[PDB]
From a paper:
Replacing serine by arginine at position 240 (S240R) was also found to rescue R273H. The crystal structures provide high-resolution information on various R273-related mutants including the oncogenic single mutants: R273H and R273C, the rescued double mutants: R273H/T284R, R273C/T284R, R273H/S240R and R273C/S240R, and their complexes with DNA. A superposition of the mutant structures onto one of the wt core domain structures shows that their 3D structures are similar to that of the wt protein, demonstrating that mutations located at the protein surface have a negligible effect on the structure of the protein. Similar geometrical features of the protein surfaces are displayed by the crystal structures of the single mutants: R273H and R273C, and of the double mutants: R273H/S240R, R273H/T284 and R273C/T284R in the absence of DNA. The mutation sites of these proteins are compared with the corresponding region of the wt p53-DNA complex by modeling the central A/T doublet as shown in Supplementary Figure S4, confirming again the inability of His or Cys residues at position 273 to interact with the DNA target. The arginine side chains of the second-site mutations in these structures (T284R and S240R) display a range of conformations in their free state, but a single conformation is observed in their DNA-bound state. Reactivation of these proteins is achieved by new interactions formed by the second-site mutations, T284R or S240R, with the DNA backbone.
The tumor suppressor p53 acts as a DNA sequence-specific transcription factor regulating and activating the expression of a range of target genes in response to genotoxic stress. This in turn initiates a cascade of signal transduction pathways leading to different cellular responses including cell-cycle arrest and apoptosis that are known to prevent cancer development (1–4). p53 binds as a tetramer to specific response elements consisting mainly of two decameric half-sites separated by a variable number of base pairs. The majority of tumor-related p53 mutations, particularly those defined as mutational ‘hotspots’, occur within the DNA-binding core domain of p53 (10). R273, a DNA-contact amino acid, is one of the most frequently altered residues in human cancer (6.4% of all somatic mutations), with mutations to histidine (46.6%) and to cysteine (39.1%) being most common.
Residue numbers in the entry: 94 to 290
Amino acid sequence: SSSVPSQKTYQGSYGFRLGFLHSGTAKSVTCTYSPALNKMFCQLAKTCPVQLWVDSTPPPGTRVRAMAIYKQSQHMTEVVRRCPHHERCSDSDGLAPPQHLIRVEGNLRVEYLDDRNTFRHSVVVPYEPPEVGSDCTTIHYNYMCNRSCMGGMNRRPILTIITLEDSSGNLLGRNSFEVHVCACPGRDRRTEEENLR
Ligand SMILES: [Zn+2]
């Protein structure tokens, strides 16, 4: 058996889009997003801000789900999970399953799912509208393995799929971005952009 979650962009009725801080590539940055590569460069277990931008307010009870998938075609059917080492280092925050790559930081309403049919992991929070004078909603994700992990991702590129779903789980919108968890995001981003013709 196997299945592959859709990664098709779907802005949907509420005009759902993702946004990221314009953080630059100084060596000290804790994370940084490349618009040219649609790629977020971030660090193990550290804050990774992702912004939700909507054009109109979704219904009450809307939820925001994050799920990782392998980028390379030949690995798409493989569930992305933490490496054995990090799983064993028993470092759950008391909410997150130790096998889950993606956590949410700073939200006590976070919910984690092991899908009993597809075996995929995901993390979901209630959708909240922006604060007054803010134009987006920010979620702090943490990625709990990097590209230096042996086993688990094992150096392979991944994407995060962000889904807006209603209270009944129906699809309202979907977006995605590549994630590269590394030691020095600023350096990795600048280097990877240096190639661009
Ligand atoms: Zn790991």
